[PDB]
Design a protein around this ligand. Structure first.
Ligand SMILES: *[C@@H]1O[C@H](CO)[C@@H](O[C@@H]2O[C@H](CO)[C@@H](O)[C@H](O)[C@H]2NC(C)=O)[C@H](O)[C@H]1NC(C)=O
Lengths: 48, 48
């Protein structure tokens, strides 16, 4: 995920958050890593 | 695979069946899952 979510834009479904992946930012944690995932989500549909 | 083969279209080779991935349908099995992989296979080539 560090390579595919932070150093790129992934198309893999539900791999870099929920929605359409735009970008991610890492944060360190005591014995691990926290990813902040920024996604695009559509809203307010109409029928045509 | 449930995320990437069923909830979307994958470009990963051989991850969602043999051929060019179109779509997949899940089925429940006892203690497991069965994937029905729908693929696109070209046929009847000519040379040019
Ligand atoms: C396209 O042309 C090639 C030859 O350039 C065909 O390959 C030949 O196929 C025949 C019959 O199977 C063999 O006897 C030859 O040995 C093959 N040639 C070579 C050099 O391998 C090929 O069959 C053609 N493709 C189509 C779809 O007709």
């Amino acid at each position: 995920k560090m390579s595919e979510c932070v150093l790129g834009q992934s198309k893999r479904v539900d791999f870099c958050g929920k929605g359409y992946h735009l970008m991610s930012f890492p944060q360190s944690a005591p014995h691990g890593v926290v990813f902040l995932h920024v996604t695009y989500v559509p809203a307010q549909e109409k029928n045509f």
